[PDB]
Structure formats: C-alpha cells, structure tokens
C-alpha cells in the first residue's frame, strides 16, 4: 500500500511484508503454515473460526517470533506490536513527480465555477493518497489473485538479444522501483520473454515486452469489456466531462505464485518475473477493465477503456459529488491516479480513451462530414497521385471530364518533370472538391444494402469514402485530421488509425446492419505479424486496432483498384469558419499599424506598430501595452508586424487567445493563403526581410494553434461594438509609435 514494504525471509525463501495498523495479529500466507501445528483456534468475524500458530521468520534478517494467522494473500500483514524495534516509514521511490504543477494545470484548465473549483482544490488534499506521487508508483488491489497459467501446453523460451544500452539507465530506475515495491521478483524460469526499448516523448526510454508467444498459449476465455465502438455509442454527453488516467492499473492486480514464471524476462542476464498483470499479456486489459467497470457500476455516467475513465454530468454540484464517490471507491480499491494527463471538470476532454475530443451534449459524438482541400502539388509525381486518386469519380460526377481537362493539360504541356500551377488551377481544384460535397452527388444510406467503407491514407490525412454496397455515389466522404503524434506513425499504421476513426462514425450509419471495409492491405493475418522495429505506434494503438477483428458484423477486404497515395500533398485545414465569441477566451491581443511621410528624404517612409494585452474575464481590463517604432516600412507591414509580436507573447499563455487586425490582408491572408504559403516555401514573393516576417506567424501557430485571428475595419467608429474600444487603444499606440523617429 502506501508504507515502505519490508523484506524478509521465513523458510529459505524471501517474501515481502507490509506494516499493519489493525489490532489483528500477523497474517502469514497460507502455504507456509501448512506443516505447522496449531496452538488454539479462534473465531474471526471480519465468525469464521481459524487456527493460530507461533512461528519464527526474519525481517531485515533479524529474527521475529510471533502469534500468527493464515492469509490467502501473497504478503505478510505484519502487526506493529510484533515488531516494537522497527518503526513505520512511508514509501520512498526514486523520482518524485511534480504533483503541484500537475494539480495547478488541472485547476487551470477547468470549466468549473470558482466555487466548485475551490471544492476541487480541497478534494486534491482529501484523498491525496489516491494520487501518483512518485514515478513508477503502482497501487495494490486487495483482491483474490489471478491465475494465468491456463491451458496445459507451455510456451517455448524466446532468446533475448542485446538492446540499445543508451536506454538502460532510464529503464533501470523502473526495474529498481518495481522491485522495491515487489512488482518484480528475481525468479529463474522455464519461459523467457523478449524485451525492447521505445523512446518516450521526454527523451527517456520506456520498456516493452514482446509476449506474442505466451499469448497463443492462453485462451481469451473471459467476459471482455465492451470494445471501443461499443463504448463510444453508449457514452453520456453532458456539460462537464472528466477523464482520469489510472497509472498502469493492471500492475495493481496480482497474479498467483505459480504464475510468476510465465511472465519471466531477462534484463542484464538476471531473469526476473512479475508479481502482477503485465502489459502485453493476452488477458491483462480485459481483467483490469472488468474490475474497474464493477467498481463503478453504481455511478450513473461512467465509461472505461484500458485505464482511461470518463465521467460526465450536467449539474456542477452532482459532478463533483459523484467524483468524490469515485475517489473513495478507487482509494479503497488500491488504485492510483496520475494527474499529468488527467482532466477534471472540463467542457471538452482532450481524449476519452480513443483519439476524439468530446464536446457539447448528445449521447453520440458528431464529426465533420466533408473532407478538406488538398494543397497544390509541387511535382509531377504529386500531380499523378492526385489524378489516380480522383479517377474513381468519372462514373457518377457528370461534370468531371471538363473539370479535369485543365489538370491533364498540365501533365504534357510542361512535360519537363516539374510543371506550373496558376492560382486559377487551385480554384479549379476547390471546385472539384465542392462538387463531391454537393448533396446531388451524395447517395443516402439504404438499410437493405450493406455499408461499404473504402479506406486509404496520404502522409498528411486519412481518406475515407462511405458507399452503399452496390451504390455509385458516396453517401459521404470523411477526411482525417491527424494529431501531432499520429503524424509520427508509419504508413500502415496511418491506415489502421484511419480505420478506427472511420468505424466510429460508421457505427451510426450501419443502423443494425453489417459493415464491409476495403483497403490496400492484402490480409489482416499478415499484419499481426508485422515486426516490432516497425511499429511506431504504442501497442495500445495496435491493440485497440485489433479488437475489431473479433466483431462478427465487420469484414475486411483487399481492394486492388486502389491508388498508391504516398505522394499526396498536404491537406489544408482551417481555424476559420469557427469564428467564436469575443470574450470567452483567456486573452485578447489588439494590434494596429501606422505609417507616415518621412522627414529625412532618404528613408521616404516611417512606420510604427501598436499592441495591447487585455483580458475580458469579469470585465475589460488591460494587462500590458506596447508601442514600437518600426523604421521605414509599409503601413501594412506595421499591421503585419504587430500580430507576430502578440502571437509570440501568447505562447506564454496556456489557453485560448484572440488577435484583432485592422488589415483585411493580414487577417484574411492568415486564413486563406497562409496554409497555402507554407506548403509553397515562400517562392516568388519580398526581397528577404518581407519573407522573414510571415514564416514566423507560421511557426508560431504550428507550436500553438489554439490562437485565433479576427479582423475589423474601424473607421469613424463611435461605439460600433463592445470590441472596438480595444482597437482604438491599439490604433492610438501604433500611431504614437509611428510619429517617433530614431
Ligand atoms: Ca491604421
């Protein structure tokens, strides 16, 4: 539990003891007492009567004799009374996590009224014991331990090859912390399981076990938790959502002693074994998620997957009241919550098990139908790929042959490898896509036919078509918006990610029917065999991906007709059309620029920018201002140069920010041609200083995209809104900055 464990021998063999608190006597695990003859017998209520003994054992090598009782558990529950010389100390592991930053970040990113927010701040110190305070700190379920030596045919010990030593240091800490708490034991065994390293985002390495041999030895004879698609249709959607990360909760369940060998692995020649459920093993995920779902069966609105728990309510009092019941259940069960990834009391939870943030209030989530604009090719190979991509539409889009003539009129005309795109060609590409998005080329879902899904993927996005089985038009397309990490996946993994995404929206359209999936992969047998140096996706991904092959209402098929897409340009997303309120953010950055005639004939011009940091929380308040003289530059470059400054000053703000511009050019260009200018390389602008001014709002939005940019005219504006006050302030500053001369 949460006292330092204590290392001991009884009869030759070593074992762990946990300091006790009750007035009960010292329980020994039941298999040591078997040969010992009983002293008296005595009825324990919490009235099962039991034999009592008097035995000798060691604690830190020193000998103890004690009046003891039998325990079905794996450890010694040690009475403080029996050991008056030793004192109880708390658990000491290697690296103390920054629980304070974690808690501050969660109190920050919260939609709770500061009233309940303050009640959460008291809850963080109410069951502080149920929070992960140390790295590698595991919990301890006091449950009946599991037996995974099922199936009589043993697996065959896999040899352990050498691995990267540059990872051994950060992995040894883990090994030593999981020994100290008894999660590993040093037990030479008949099985050897292979081990590999994978890099962690922080620059350390985390260890992976390749259990694919053991797993074919044991059967999935167990009531599996509902799968991703089962959970995502059932979930309640109400105002306040919350997700909690069990820190490797499967490590909390123990396994029987006769099972330790099965889990064995070698690390620096010494062959260790697991006291607890291992990650990789066939039945871990379902046994742990089973127990979780039992523990929260009384809670109205809860969904669990792997170790991620999501709970949501409408009434902010009832949310935190239910959440305390959960904290109690998890504490008394021995579980351990990690607040680094956890998200409490938020109107949008960044992920509820799968890769999809939750928002608003319906029982089912609801995603954007239409796909996004592709950017222009930079190459012949990039043009041929998109051609071969659109080729399927000839048969159901009447205005295709014409639309596409100009693009082909681009293959042979500039027959010199690289071609040339006019700006009107990009307008024709957008016209192409809009056709496919018009409701006359979209079929309707037919409950008699089966539901067909055609899946491919570029490097930038996944491409998904939905058809009816015999249909000639697609019900709806669906493009995929890869997360920052999803981008790091290999190709085939991009295809499988996209499959999970597509099947979540699909679980709505099938409406009691079957689903057929067509893809460029020849088998769903050969792919489980893909070697682990190639899997660039966490095996949580590969698991969630392969849970779908146990569903009878889903079949996978190889479509030879599909085009090779490893040469599609970038998709052009947009933070545009979601223009939102003026005041609901966490900060507002007004911007302006002026330029006037120059006093020295040589410079010819003279510009100044202006910037305002205001927050519109309870009411308008100004946090800082700025009036910066720029030199001889375009007035439009003052208005441009001001938003770069306020974007850079925003990276310091963990939250949503708003940036206001007088300049239609900047405010539109930062919405319509910026995603384009990026995938162009700033070619044929403008000498060099001009180009080195646009790139930096690019890079600054890349790093933080939760920053929006609006526009306004603002001429002769008396009080045209509540919003123009700030932009008059900012126009005063940029004009002030203009008049000053160096
Ligand atoms: Ca102006």
Numbering used by the authors: 7 to 52, 56 to 694, 697 to 753
Quote the study that presented this structure, word for word.
A cleavage between the N-terminus of integrase (IN) and the C-terminus of the RNase H domain of RT produces mature IN and PR-RT from the Pol polyprotein. The mature PR-RT has all of the enzymatic functions of PR and RT [reviewed in]. The arrangement of the subdomains of PFV RT is similar to that of the p51 subunit of HIV-1 RT while the PR structurally resembles a single subunit of the catalytically active HIV-1 PR dimer.
Two mutations, H507D and S584K, were made in the PR-RT. The PR-RT mutant C280S/H507D/S584K, designated CSH, gave a 4-fold increase in expression compared to the WT in bacterial strains. When compared to WT, the CSH mutant had similar RNase H activity and showed a modest reduction in the polymerase activity. The structure of the WT PR-RT was initially solved by using the anomalous signal from the selenomethionine (SeMet)-substituted CSH mutant, and the model obtained was used as the search model for molecular replacement using the WT data. Despite differences in the unit-cell parameters, particularly along the x-axis, the structures of CSH and WT PR-RTs are highly superimposable (RMSD = 0.785 Å). The connection subdomain is further tilted slightly towards the polymerase active site such that it sits almost parallel to the palm of the RT compared to its position in the p66 subunit of HIV-1 RT where the two subdomains are orthogonal. This compact fold allows helix L (K in HIV-1 RT) to pack against H, while helix O (L in HIV-1 RT) tilts towards the active site loop positioning T552 of PFV RT to form a hydrogen bond with Y314, and T556 with H236, while H507 forms a bifurcated hydrogen bond with S237 and N364. The H507D mutant employed in the SeMet protein also makes analogous contacts, and the SeMet PR-RT crystallizes much faster than WT.
